[PDB]
Scaffold this motif. Structure first.
Motif, PDB file in Angstrom:
ATOM      1  N   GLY A  59       0.921  -1.121  -0.297  1.00 28.49           N
ATOM      2  CA  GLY A  59      -0.363   0.153  -0.165  1.00 28.49           C
ATOM      3  C   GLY A  59       0.852   1.195  -0.587  1.00 28.49           C
ATOM      4  O   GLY A  59       2.216   1.129  -0.259  1.00 28.49           O
ATOM      5  N   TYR A  60       0.054   2.299   0.526  1.00 25.24           N
ATOM      6  CA  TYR A  60       0.502   3.579   0.196  1.00 25.24           C
ATOM      7  C   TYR A  60       1.926   3.946   1.243  1.00 25.24           C
ATOM      8  O   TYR A  60       1.367   4.008   2.395  1.00 25.24           O
ATOM      9  N   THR A  61       2.860   4.440   0.759  1.00 29.08           N
ATOM     10  CA  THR A  61       4.308   4.238   1.920  1.00 29.08           C
ATOM     11  C   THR A  61       5.174   2.786   1.949  1.00 29.08           C
ATOM     12  O   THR A  61       5.973   2.962   2.507  1.00 29.08           O
ATOM     13  N   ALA A  62       4.443   1.404   1.626  1.00 36.93           N
ATOM     14  CA  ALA A  62       4.824   1.072   1.592  1.00 36.93           C
ATOM     15  C   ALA A  62       6.160   0.324   0.442  1.00 36.93           C
ATOM     16  O   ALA A  62       5.714   0.338  -0.221  1.00 36.93           O
ATOM     17  N   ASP A  63       6.706  -1.014   0.953  1.00 35.79           N
ATOM     18  CA  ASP A  63       7.686  -1.830   0.690  1.00 35.79           C
ATOM     19  C   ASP A  63       6.907  -3.183   0.447  1.00 35.79           C
ATOM     20  O   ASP A  63       6.299  -3.517   1.254  1.00 35.79           O
ATOM     21  N   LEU A 124      -3.922 -17.276 -12.301  1.00 34.43           N
ATOM     22  CA  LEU A 124      -3.487 -16.177 -11.795  1.00 34.43           C
ATOM     23  C   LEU A 124      -4.884 -15.935 -11.052  1.00 34.43           C
ATOM     24  O   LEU A 124      -5.295 -15.716 -11.482  1.00 34.43           O
ATOM     25  N   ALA A 125      -3.926 -14.718 -10.115  1.00 36.74           N
ATOM     26  CA  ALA A 125      -4.794 -13.537  -9.093  1.00 36.74           C
ATOM     27  C   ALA A 125      -3.904 -12.959  -8.245  1.00 36.74           C
ATOM     28  O   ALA A 125      -2.637 -12.672  -9.393  1.00 36.74           O
ATOM     29  N   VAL A 126      -4.624 -12.127  -7.728  1.00 39.35           N
ATOM     30  CA  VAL A 126      -4.435 -10.458  -7.611  1.00 39.35           C
ATOM     31  C   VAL A 126      -4.485 -10.470  -6.574  1.00 39.35           C
ATOM     32  O   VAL A 126      -5.294 -10.999  -5.766  1.00 39.35           O
ATOM     33  N   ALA A 127      -3.564  -9.935  -5.129  1.00 38.69           N
ATOM     34  CA  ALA A 127      -3.958  -9.425  -4.212  1.00 38.69           C
ATOM     35  C   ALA A 127      -3.203  -8.118  -3.432  1.00 38.69           C
ATOM     36  O   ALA A 127      -2.156  -7.854  -4.633  1.00 38.69           O
ATOM     37  N   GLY A 128      -3.502  -7.350  -2.550  1.00 40.78           N
ATOM     38  CA  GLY A 128      -2.913  -5.938  -2.344  1.00 40.78           C
ATOM     39  C   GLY A 128      -3.379  -4.906  -0.701  1.00 40.78           C
ATOM     40  O   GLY A 128      -4.448  -5.618  -0.360  1.00 40.78           O
ATOM     41  N   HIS A 129      -2.715  -4.540  -0.544  1.00 40.79           N
ATOM     42  CA  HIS A 129      -2.656  -4.218   1.177  1.00 40.79           C
ATOM     43  C   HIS A 129      -2.852  -2.750   0.525  1.00 40.79           C
ATOM     44  O   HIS A 129      -2.966  -1.946   0.160  1.00 40.79           O
ATOM     45  N   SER A 130      -4.404  -1.995   0.654  1.00 37.02           N
ATOM     46  CA  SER A 130      -4.549  -1.028   0.907  1.00 37.02           C
ATOM     47  C   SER A 130      -4.560  -0.434  -0.133  1.00 37.02           C
ATOM     48  O   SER A 130      -5.927  -0.615  -0.995  1.00 37.02           O
ATOM     49  N   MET A 131      -3.745   0.866  -0.418  1.00 39.27           N
ATOM     50  CA  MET A 131      -4.490   1.367  -1.529  1.00 39.27           C
ATOM     51  C   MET A 131      -3.864  -0.019  -3.227  1.00 39.27           C
ATOM     52  O   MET A 131      -3.762  -0.153  -4.280  1.00 39.27           O
ATOM     53  N   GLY A 132      -3.021  -0.497  -2.555  1.00 39.70           N
ATOM     54  CA  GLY A 132      -2.476  -1.955  -3.551  1.00 39.70           C
ATOM     55  C   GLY A 132      -3.921  -3.156  -3.632  1.00 39.70           C
ATOM     56  O   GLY A 132      -3.941  -3.578  -4.674  1.00 39.70           O
ATOM     57  N   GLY A 133      -4.993  -2.793  -2.128  1.00 41.81           N
ATOM     58  CA  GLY A 133      -5.969  -3.842  -2.776  1.00 41.81           C
ATOM     59  C   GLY A 133      -7.002  -2.794  -3.494  1.00 41.81           C
ATOM     60  O   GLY A 133      -8.185  -3.389  -4.513  1.00 41.81           O
ATOM     61  N   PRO A 151      -8.502  -7.671  -2.135  1.00 42.54           N
ATOM     62  CA  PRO A 151      -8.120  -7.300  -1.504  1.00 42.54           C
ATOM     63  C   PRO A 151      -8.237  -7.008   0.022  1.00 42.54           C
ATOM     64  O   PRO A 151      -9.008  -7.375   0.351  1.00 42.54           O
ATOM     65  N   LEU A 152      -7.124  -6.380   0.732  1.00 42.63           N
ATOM     66  CA  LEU A 152      -7.092  -6.178   2.146  1.00 42.63           C
ATOM     67  C   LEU A 152      -6.848  -4.985   2.523  1.00 42.63           C
ATOM     68  O   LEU A 152      -6.078  -4.071   2.291  1.00 42.63           O
ATOM     69  N   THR A 153      -7.367  -4.834   3.348  1.00 38.82           N
ATOM     70  CA  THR A 153      -8.458  -3.541   3.986  1.00 38.82           C
ATOM     71  C   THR A 153      -8.073  -2.403   3.021  1.00 38.82           C
ATOM     72  O   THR A 153      -7.177  -1.503   3.471  1.00 38.82           O
ATOM     73  N   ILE A 169     -12.778  -9.232   0.295  1.00 42.31           N
ATOM     74  CA  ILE A 169     -12.211  -8.781   0.951  1.00 42.31           C
ATOM     75  C   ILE A 169     -12.473  -8.254   2.193  1.00 42.31           C
ATOM     76  O   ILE A 169     -13.107  -8.985   2.473  1.00 42.31           O
ATOM     77  N   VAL A 170     -10.570  -8.327   3.195  1.00 44.57           N
ATOM     78  CA  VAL A 170     -11.061  -8.019   3.987  1.00 44.57           C
ATOM     79  C   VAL A 170     -10.581  -6.708   5.110  1.00 44.57           C
ATOM     80  O   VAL A 170     -10.088  -5.935   4.183  1.00 44.57           O
ATOM     81  N   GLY A 171     -11.669  -6.402   5.427  1.00 48.60           N
ATOM     82  CA  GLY A 171     -12.150  -5.393   5.655  1.00 48.60           C
ATOM     83  C   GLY A 171     -11.052  -5.119   7.458  1.00 48.60           C
ATOM     84  O   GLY A 171     -11.175  -6.573   8.321  1.00 48.60           O
ATOM     85  N   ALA A 172     -10.984  -4.054   8.100  1.00 49.34           N
ATOM     86  CA  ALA A 172     -10.209  -4.358   9.534  1.00 49.34           C
ATOM     87  C   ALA A 172     -10.943  -2.948  10.605  1.00 49.34           C
ATOM     88  O   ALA A 172     -11.512  -2.469  10.240  1.00 49.34           O
TER      89      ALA A 172
END
Length: 258
Positions: A59-63, A124-133, A151-153, A169-172
């Motif tokens: 996600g945003y700011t993240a590696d 093939l499939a996709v996943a991602g955190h926050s803006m990556g989600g 999509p994770l949070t 979708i995983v929400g927190a």
């Protein structure tokens, strides 16, 4: 009966720990790719089988390192997983979507021989955190051939994604970065009614929940990837008739539970 089926009959407990495949890693240098910032491929060893591929965005700011535990976790249960770094940590969701696409093209065409031998690039499939989600939701629109999206949070200013790719979708619950009332929940609600969809909301969880070992994230992400990438209906049990005390909310259209 299912040629894509891998690994043991699942138990919920087992899905909270690394699986039956040892995992190798390959570092994809930032310079060697145009289309994303490099990353790390996690892939099974000790096998002659082939497996579906997953591209995952931070996600945003993240590696990429912010999802290392989950790349390893997935690969260990039988997947080839490329966790990217983005060209810039400030890239927005739709840019991340396009970088996920580049990552999948790289995995198929340019990865090392040991990785290619383990990859069934048909699946093939996709996943991602926050803006990556948010990026995961967008690429799901763009590419109906994908087997699944997690999509994770997730975070995105666009609330409506017209995709036929199965989405979990995983929400927190306590997320302050991408509050679920403004992001996860509207994303769920506005996905087509004909597309298999699930929302799992982690009880009292923070935005950072996906960045360290998390049992419920492990259970649901493995299960969704298994069900759709591998057609593995042994994982329906975790995704149907759900009453999960780790969750503050669970929603689905139950298309996968006839």
């Amino acid at each position: 009966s299912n040629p894509y089926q891998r690994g043991p009959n699942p138990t919920r407990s087992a899905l909270t720990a690394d699986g039956p495949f040892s995992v190798a890693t390959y570092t994809v240098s930032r310079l060697s790719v145009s289309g994303f910032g490099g990353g790390v491929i996690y892939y099974p060893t000790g096998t002659s089988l082939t497996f579906g591929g997953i591209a995952m965005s931070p996600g945003y700011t993240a590696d990429a390192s912010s999802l290392a535990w989950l790349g390893r976790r997935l690969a260990s249960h039988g997947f080839v997983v490329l966790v990217i770094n983005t060209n810039s940590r400030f890239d927005y969701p739709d840019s991340r979507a396009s970088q996920l696409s580049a990552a999948l093209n790289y995995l198929r065409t340019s990865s090392p021989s040991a990785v290619r031998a383990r990859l069934d690039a048909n699946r093939l499939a996709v996943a991602g955190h926050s803006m990556g989600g948010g990026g995961t939701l967008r690429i799901a629109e763009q590419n109906p051939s994908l087997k699944a999206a997690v999509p994770l949070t997730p975070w995105h200013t666009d609330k409506t994604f017209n995709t036929s790719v199965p989405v979990l979708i995983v929400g927190a619950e306590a997320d302050t970065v991408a509050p679920v009332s403004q992001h996860a929940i509207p994303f769920y609600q506005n996905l087509p009614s004909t597309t298999p969809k699930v929302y799992v909301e982690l009880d009292n969880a923070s935005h950072f929940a996906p960045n360290s070992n998390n049992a419920a994230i492990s259970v649901y992400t493995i299960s969704w990837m298994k069900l759709w990438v591998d057609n593995d209906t042994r994982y329906r049990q975790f995704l149907c008739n759900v009453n999960d005390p780790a969750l503050s909310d669970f929603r689905t259209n139950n298309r996968h539970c006839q």
